[PDB]
Design a protein around this ligand. Structure first.
Ligand SMILES: *C(=O)[C@H]([C@@H](C)O)[C@H]1CC(SCCNC=N)=C(C(=O)O)N1
Length: 351
């Protein structure tokens, strides 16, 4: 832990924890390709359990990066094509609004207005089909971006259909295991419960609730160590031995659409580096310009993903061209601006 990294990290995170009243936090900085860990506070306030490098945190929306890479891997395997109509994988989706909506639109939130959340009412596979059949797009496909769990969630569920594997089995065997993310789970096993941090919302300990397509959109839990490893894998995909996976990682970081200064990948979001911090709301509908054809992963990019659950807030960002990256996991959902400002403060300093 070079003193410079210790210094920038502690000087940035200590005040953050104090201002945001965060009970527990873990950070990993990947510098010149190697990880450095830092931990503060509590994983469980009541039982006085501290945050350690083995504490599991709910990644919330950061889970989408895993879904995007798993989708990229299925593409790489030839199991699906992003240009394929959604109906090719869900024939029961006969409603006419689906004509022209492809797996690319689902993966990138450009299907035409799918909702941020699947309604809680949807439980069964039957209610889900009914939800998508009855959904009425406000816009034609590929014209506007509206971040949506019901959009990338459907993408994740359909991308694994050809494999015959459940989404969780596919994720475990095709992404977690090959990358040695041995403490990353969609469902936390009883043996690992001792390490599962509690999230805190209004001072109350809470864990994420089950919901339709939760695994695919916001259901992964992981340790600061596994997330540092996930960041290393995304920083340098070429070191990954599994060909299809190496490929999927690259596909998830290609630039499919542009909205202002940001580009939409599969899961990951990117901005050209260098980026102004200030340049990095329940619903923000934004027109998008298609990148035809998609730009392959650009090394000079700030690649990132923010995510939260009712009780946790997380952020991951990295710059391929600098072999630099960071992961910040907390068991309190605090403002996104504060997460990005802290990450930029640290990475700019190490830049
Ligand atoms: C990630 O996808 C999640 C969710 C839609 O599954 C979003 C939710 C939030 S915070 C929304 C309002 N909550 C207030 N306590 C975030 C975020 O990272 O800010 N991600």
């Amino acid at each position: 832990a070079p003193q410079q990294i210790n210094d920038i990290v502690h000087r940035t995170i200590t005040p953050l924890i104090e201002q945001q009243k965060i009970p527990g936090m873990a950070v990993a900085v990947i510098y010149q390709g190697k990880p450095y860990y830092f931990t503060w506070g509590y994983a469980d306030i009541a039982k006085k359990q501290p945050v350690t490098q083995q504490t599991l945190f709910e990644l919330g929306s950061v889970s989408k990066t895993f879904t995007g890479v798993l989708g990229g891997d299925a593409i790489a395997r030839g199991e699906i094509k992003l240009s394929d109509p959604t109906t090719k994988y869900w024939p029961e989706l006969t409603a006419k609004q689906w004509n022209g909506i492809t797996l690319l639109h689902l993966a990138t939130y450009t299907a035409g207005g799918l909702p941020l959340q699947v309604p809680d009412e949807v439980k069964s596979s039957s209610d889900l089909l009914r939800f998508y059949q009855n959904w009425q797009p406000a816009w034609a496909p590929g014209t506007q971006r509206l971040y949506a769990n019901s959009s990338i969630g459907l993408f994740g569920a359909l991308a694994v259909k050809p494999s015959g594997l459940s989404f969780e089995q596919a994720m475990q065997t095709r992404v977690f295991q090959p990358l040695k993310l041995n403490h990353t789970w969609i469902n936390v096993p009883p043996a690992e419960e001792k390490n599962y941090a509690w999230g805190y919302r209004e001072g109350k300990a809470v864990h994420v609730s089950p919901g339709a397509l939760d695994a695919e959109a916001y259901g992964v839990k992981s340790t600061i160590e596994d997330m540092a490893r996930w960041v290393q894998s995304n920083l340098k995909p070429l070191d990954i031995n599994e060909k299809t996976l190496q490929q999927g990682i690259q596909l998830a970081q290609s630039r499919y659409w542009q909205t202002g200064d940001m580009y939409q990948g599969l899961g990951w979001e990117m901005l050209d580096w260098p980026v102004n911090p200030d340049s990095i709301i329940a619903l923000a509908a934004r027109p998008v310009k298609a990148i035809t054809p998609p730009t392959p992963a650009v090394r000079a990019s700030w690649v990132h993903k923010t995510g939260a659950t009712g009780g946790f807030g997380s952020y991951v960002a990295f710059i391929p061209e600098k072999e630099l990256g960071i992961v910040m996991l907390a068991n309190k959902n605090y403002p996104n601006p504060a997460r990005v400002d802290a990450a930029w403060q640290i990475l700019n300093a190490l830049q």
